[model samples]
Target: MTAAPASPQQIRDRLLQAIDPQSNIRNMVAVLEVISSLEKYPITKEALEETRLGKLINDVRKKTKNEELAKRAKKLLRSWQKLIEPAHQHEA
Candidate 1:
């Protein structure tokens, strides 16, 4: 079946439906690393905590019960989480 393009609401709804709280902290750690590596200053711990809300929204889609989607999310989460520590080391 051809999929309809997602309306903004539909996209937002599906995203809200998928959050995996367990993976968010690690995900943010990875993102902070990238942002830091591109800048003069590393991201602060406060900034990381502040961004947690967004990460909650961001990760919702990764916890779907749909096996295929869940599997994909698991893989993606692993890839992102795995980068966090090493990326921090590189930035240091």
Candidate 2:
């Protein structure tokens, strides 16, 4: 069975730990690895649009020095994209 997801409000900073310009691969992995678990968490469509975190990860995909980090970012972005395809949206 699926479990409850995390709140968006807090995790954004954790995401920044990886995306920050000075971060290391180990720090990046620890955070992004949790996000792989987050693949099933409630990263709502609104989370994608009204978000600074999403954009940071976007650049991580685009310009991150590490290939592994970019790949992880891409997969996460891919998962969120697929999640959006199944339904129409409305602002809450």
Candidate 3:
């Protein structure tokens, strides 16, 4: 009687499809955080690097009319960077 729960890929697909740095930045960031926190989905540098949202964030970081958007974009960019690679690296 109830609809089935959304799959991880389904959620990811929806989030990625809906990502918009200008109007949907907060939702996009939150979705990315959820995807990363789940630890089940693949979160690769190549993957994030290829995303439209990622490029938008980079564009905002490099050139944006609003200072606040620029600042937020930089922080979000760093968050993704950290997600891809931790701050410290050590030889195993």
Instruction: Find the candidate with the highest TM-score and give its number.
Output: 2
The TM-score of candidate 2 is 0.45
lDDT of 3 by residue, 2-79 (tens): 123233334445454445534344354444444343334433344565553454444334445455665654434454
Candidate 1 vs 3: which has more TM-score: 3
Q: Write the per-residue lDDT of candidate 2 for residues 10-75, one digit (tens) a residue.
A: 556566555565533436554654455455564656676665456555544644546776665554
Question: What order do you get sorting by TM-score, best first?
Answer: 2, 3, 1
Residue range 15-36, candidate 1, lDDT tens digits: 3333233554334434333322
TM-scores of the candidates are 0.25, 0.45, 0.30
Q: After superposition, which runs of candidate 1 have C-alpha atoms over 4 Å from their true positions?
A: 1-50, 53-65, 83-92
Query: Higher TM-score: candidate 1 or 2?
Result: 2
Q: For model 1, what is the error of residue 60's alpha carbon versus the real structure, in angstroms, after optimal superposition?
A: 3.1
lDDT of 1: 0.36
Model 3 TM: 0.30
